[PDB]
Write a protein that holds these residues in place. Structure first.
Motif, PDB file in Angstrom:
ATOM      1  N   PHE A  91       0.842  -1.341  -0.184  1.00 57.80           N
ATOM      2  CA  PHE A  91      -0.002  -0.005  -0.019  1.00 57.80           C
ATOM      3  C   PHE A  91       0.928   1.467  -0.268  1.00 57.80           C
ATOM      4  O   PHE A  91       1.990   1.331   0.557  1.00 57.80           O
ATOM      5  N   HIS A  92       0.341   2.458  -0.455  1.00 55.36           N
ATOM      6  CA  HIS A  92       0.924   3.702  -0.489  1.00 55.36           C
ATOM      7  C   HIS A  92      -0.177   4.629  -0.728  1.00 55.36           C
ATOM      8  O   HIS A  92      -1.166   4.326  -0.665  1.00 55.36           O
ATOM      9  N   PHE A  93       0.301   6.049  -0.393  1.00 59.40           N
ATOM     10  CA  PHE A  93      -0.648   7.049  -0.416  1.00 59.40           C
ATOM     11  C   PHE A  93      -0.478   8.126  -1.742  1.00 59.40           C
ATOM     12  O   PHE A  93       1.009   8.419  -2.013  1.00 59.40           O
ATOM     13  N   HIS A  94      -1.268   8.852  -1.929  1.00 58.33           N
ATOM     14  CA  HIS A  94      -1.299  10.154  -2.269  1.00 58.33           C
ATOM     15  C   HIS A  94      -1.602  11.330  -1.889  1.00 58.33           C
ATOM     16  O   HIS A  94      -2.759  10.968  -1.111  1.00 58.33           O
ATOM     17  N   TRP A  95      -1.041  12.160  -1.852  1.00 59.89           N
ATOM     18  CA  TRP A  95      -1.639  13.496  -0.789  1.00 59.89           C
ATOM     19  C   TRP A  95      -1.268  14.927  -1.323  1.00 59.89           C
ATOM     20  O   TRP A  95      -0.397  15.007  -2.321  1.00 59.89           O
ATOM     21  N   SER A 103      -6.051  13.776  -3.120  1.00 58.21           N
ATOM     22  CA  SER A 103      -6.595  12.549  -3.781  1.00 58.21           C
ATOM     23  C   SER A 103      -6.524  12.624  -5.256  1.00 58.21           C
ATOM     24  O   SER A 103      -6.446  13.382  -5.961  1.00 58.21           O
ATOM     25  N   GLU A 104      -6.596  11.241  -5.997  1.00 53.37           N
ATOM     26  CA  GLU A 104      -6.632  11.029  -7.155  1.00 53.37           C
ATOM     27  C   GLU A 104      -8.017  10.869  -8.031  1.00 53.37           C
ATOM     28  O   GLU A 104      -8.328  11.798  -8.736  1.00 53.37           O
ATOM     29  N   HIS A 105      -8.742  10.036  -7.235  1.00 52.59           N
ATOM     30  CA  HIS A 105     -10.312  10.166  -7.774  1.00 52.59           C
ATOM     31  C   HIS A 105     -10.789  11.100  -6.932  1.00 52.59           C
ATOM     32  O   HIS A 105     -10.218  11.570  -5.836  1.00 52.59           O
ATOM     33  N   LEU A 116      -5.408   6.152  -0.120  1.00 50.28           N
ATOM     34  CA  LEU A 116      -4.723   5.180   0.158  1.00 50.28           C
ATOM     35  C   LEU A 116      -5.155   4.071  -0.986  1.00 50.28           C
ATOM     36  O   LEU A 116      -6.149   3.853  -1.409  1.00 50.28           O
ATOM     37  N   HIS A 117      -3.863   3.434  -1.492  1.00 49.06           N
ATOM     38  CA  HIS A 117      -4.012   2.525  -2.634  1.00 49.06           C
ATOM     39  C   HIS A 117      -3.428   1.263  -2.178  1.00 49.06           C
ATOM     40  O   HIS A 117      -2.340   1.254  -1.682  1.00 49.06           O
ATOM     41  N   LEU A 118      -4.349   0.308  -1.664  1.00 47.65           N
ATOM     42  CA  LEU A 118      -3.713  -1.048  -1.424  1.00 47.65           C
ATOM     43  C   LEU A 118      -3.909  -2.038  -2.821  1.00 47.65           C
ATOM     44  O   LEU A 118      -4.789  -2.257  -3.380  1.00 47.65           O
ATOM     45  N   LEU A 195      -2.915   1.785 -13.700  1.00 47.16           N
ATOM     46  CA  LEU A 195      -2.113   2.466 -12.697  1.00 47.16           C
ATOM     47  C   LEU A 195      -2.068   3.946 -12.949  1.00 47.16           C
ATOM     48  O   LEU A 195      -2.254   4.482 -14.023  1.00 47.16           O
ATOM     49  N   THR A 196      -1.950   4.715 -11.792  1.00 42.04           N
ATOM     50  CA  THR A 196      -2.009   6.230 -11.924  1.00 42.04           C
ATOM     51  C   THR A 196      -0.534   6.728 -11.789  1.00 42.04           C
ATOM     52  O   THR A 196      -0.514   8.043 -12.014  1.00 42.04           O
ATOM     53  N   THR A 197       0.325   6.082 -11.894  1.00 45.10           N
ATOM     54  CA  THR A 197       1.735   6.533 -12.240  1.00 45.10           C
ATOM     55  C   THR A 197       1.985   5.988 -13.682  1.00 45.10           C
ATOM     56  O   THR A 197       1.800   4.459 -13.806  1.00 45.10           O
TER      57      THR A 197
HETATM   58 ZN   LIG Z   1      -1.368   4.998  -6.221  1.00 45.19          ZN
END
Ligand SMILES: [Zn+2]
Ligand SMILES: CC(=O)[C@H]1CC[C@H]2[C@@H]3CC[C@@H]4C[C@H](OS(N)(=O)=O)CC[C@]4(C)[C@H]3CC[C@]12C
Length: 258
Positions: A91-95, A103-105, A116-118, A195-197
């Motif tokens: 898991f990781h985060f975007h902030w 958030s991304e969404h 949070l992405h699991l 994937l968002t990256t």
């Molecule tokens: Zn992510």
């Protein structure tokens, strides 16, 4: 050059190295709650994290991640929109730099402070490298963070971030229970995405929980002290590591709930 989130290397540049950035099923997206169709055929999400084995926490220069033992079915996602069994990898985060983004969404264009992405991968493909080459290879469980009350289950993560400040740094991170990061409800939205990256691979079944978790200002401020840069390099705070919403194109977002 090498991609990041800055003016010269950020999301608007990624298509040059990763042309799939302009593809037909890119993530994230805005979830328009009134247009998402309630699908009564969607099953409850099955989250089986009792035997999770966390291994390490790592600053990868784009986020921080907690990595798990995915050499056996110890921490798995199944049911929901999924066929088969998906092992938890990390898991990781975007902030954000401030609470009004990160958030991304988004939900009716609302941005949360973090996401949070699991990340889980389909065991039928045997390894995650193979899974990212398949349209049903990964399932990412997305959880929004808002700022208010502290999340007690997040504190063990926040307290070690001083030890991984810069790109490349890692630490032992055993016996972390990711069940402490989950909201009460497993009501979700789902859609096919990416994937968002980079490499933005179109391999993800997205499962985005409706219910955010609350974290404290002190917890998210510790995220914002991380560095994109490596140890001897000019200090560039690791903030605003999110990709904006992408065109929905020929896709339907389904809701597990009315
Ligand atoms: Zn992510
Ligand atoms: C190209 C490759 O080997 C894949 C296999 C697993 C992938 C990783 C899975 C975990 C996360 C998922 C993440 O996508 S997200 N933000 O939608 O959850 C993009 C970065 C990264 C590190 C992925 C980068 C590309 C990886 C390394």
């Amino acid at each position: 050059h090498h991609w990041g989130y800055g003016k010269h290397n950020g999301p608007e540049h990624w298509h040059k190295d990763f042309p799939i950035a302009k593809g037909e099923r890119q993530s994230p997206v805005d979830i328009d709650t009134h247009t998402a169709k309630y699908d009564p055929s969607l099953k409850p999400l099955s989250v089986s994290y009792d035997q999770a084995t966390s291994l390490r926490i790592l600053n990868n220069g784009h986020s921080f991640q907690v990595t798990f033992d995915d050499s056996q079915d110890k921490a798995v996602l199944k049911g929901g929109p999924l066929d088969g069994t998906y092992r938890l990898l990390q898991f990781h985060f975007h902030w954000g730099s401030l609470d009004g983004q990160g958030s991304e969404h988004t939900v009716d264009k609302k941005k949360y402070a973090a996401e949070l992405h699991l990340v889980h991968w389909n065991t039928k493909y045997g390894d995650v490298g193979k899974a990212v080459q398949q349209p049903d290879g990964l399932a990412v469980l997305g959880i929004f963070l808002k700022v208010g009350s502290a999340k007690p289950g997040l504190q063990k993560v926040v307290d070690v971030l001083d030890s991984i400040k810069t790109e490349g740094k890692s630490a032992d991170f055993t016996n972390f229970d990711p069940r402490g990061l989950l909201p009460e409800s497993l009501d979700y939205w789902t859609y096919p995405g990416s994937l968002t990256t980079p490499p933005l691979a179109e391999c993800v079944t997205w499962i985005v929980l409706k219910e955010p978790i609350s974290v404290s200002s002190e917890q998210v401020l510790k995220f914002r002290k991380l560095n994109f840069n490596g140890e001897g390099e000019p200090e560039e705070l690791m903030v605003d590591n999110w990709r904006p919403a992408q065109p929905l194109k020929n896709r339907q977002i389904k809701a597990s709930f009315k």
